[PDB]
């Protein structure tokens, strides 16, 4: 199944934040309307914030998170959770190796803002 792709409400602001937990340098690309709208890069084995930004979901509302280490896509896991029918989290984990902790880059998207 496709992972890391979320349909947000169209033309809506959302937050995206990435954390790193790996010896490899993480590159996180956030795509809106299939074009790269933000790129975060960093290295941490202690959950450091490697990027945070507010973006607009575009005309289609399609948001895609891609994670790579030295150009190779990591394996993604993802889900969306909704609390009290209003507060949205789109969650991504990624695995860049073989230990399958899936925390190597962790990406949190949340909306609405404001």
């Amino acid at each position: 199944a496709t992972q890391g792709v979320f349909t947000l409400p169209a033309n809506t602001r959302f937050g995206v934040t990435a954390f790193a937990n790996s010896s490899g340098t993480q590159t996180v690309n956030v795509l809106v309307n299939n074009e790269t709208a933000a790129t975060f890069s960093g290295q941490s084995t202690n959950n450091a914030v490697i990027g945070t930004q507010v973006l607009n979901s575009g005309s289609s509302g399609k948001v895609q998170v891609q994670v790579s280490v030295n150009g190779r896509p990591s394996d993604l896991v993802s889900a969306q959770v909704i609390l009290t029918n209003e507060l949205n989290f789109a969650l991504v984990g990624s695995e860049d190796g073989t230990d399958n902790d899936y925390n190597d880059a962790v990406v949190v998207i949340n909306w609405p803002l404001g």
């Binding site: 790996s22 010896s23 030295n70």
Partner: peptide
């Protein structure tokens, strides 16, 4: 990261 021997011979 990667598919590896010895924590990284292979990548």
């Amino acid at each position: 990261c990667x598919w590896x021997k010895x924590k990284x011979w292979x990548c």
